[PDB]
Amino acid sequence: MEPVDPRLEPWKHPGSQPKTACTTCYCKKCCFHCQVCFTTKALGISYGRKKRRQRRRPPQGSQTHQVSLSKQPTSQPRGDPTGPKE
């Protein structure tokens, strides 16, 4: 599929890195919150815009969550509640 990897210049795409309900589930199992996705409604795999033409190497070392490789603490993590480890 086309918008899979999380690195958009129109940015709200956490995508799939702690992968369960698309991204983040359960609170105690997959990354801290009960279901906080954001990619599933707005921007990602077949979601909201559906075919956004951008991928560009985001998991380059360690973890993505909600980053896009540029200024690493990217404001607030809106879907996937953590951020970098690179």
The structure was resolved experimentally with: NMR
Work out how many domains the chain is built from and give that number.
1
Q: How far apart are CA 47 and CA 39, in angstroms?
A: 7
Query: Angle at the Cα of 27 (from 26 to 31), degrees rounded to 5?
Result: 100
Q: How far apart are CA 50 and CA 83, in angstroms?
A: 24
Q: How far apart are CA 79 and CA 18, in angstroms?
A: 10
Q: How far apart are CA 25 and CA 22, in angstroms?
A: 8
34 is an annotated ligand-binding site residue: yes
Query: Angle at the Cα of 68 (from 8 to 59), degrees rounded to 5?
Result: 115
25 is an annotated ligand-binding site residue: yes
3-state DSSP call for residue 59? coil
Q: How far apart are CA 1 and CA 50, in angstroms?
A: 10
Q: How far apart are CA 47 and CA 24, in angstroms?
A: 16
Instruction: Give the residue carrying structure tokens 């956004």.
Output: 52
37 is an annotated ligand-binding site residue: yes
31 is an annotated ligand-binding site residue: no
Structural domain harbouring 50: 1-86
Helices (H), 1-86: none
Domain with 25 in it: what CATH number?
4.10.20.10
Question: Do the Cβ atoms of 63 and 84 come closer than 8 Å?
Answer: yes
